[PDB]
């Protein structure tokens, strides 16, 4: 699952 974040990178993704 990937969701937006405040701190860069703005793209986050889980290890699963």
Say if residues 10 and 4 touch (Cβ distance below 8 Å): yes
Structure tokens at 1: 């699952």
d(CA 12, CA 16): 12
Determination technique for this PDB entry? NMR
Contacts of 15 (CB under 8 A, 6+ apart): none
Say if residues 2 and 12 touch (Cβ distance below 8 Å): yes
Torsion of CA 7, 9, 10, 13, to 10 degrees: -110
DSSP code per residue over 1-16: -EEE-SSSSSEEE---
Contacts of 13 (CB under 8 A, 6+ apart): 1, 2
| Cis status, amide bond into 9, omega within 30 of 0 | yes
The rounded Cα 5 to chain-centroid distance in angstroms is 6
């Amino acid at each position: 699952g990937c969701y937006p974040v405040p701190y860069p990178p703005f793209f986050t993704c889980d290890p699963n």
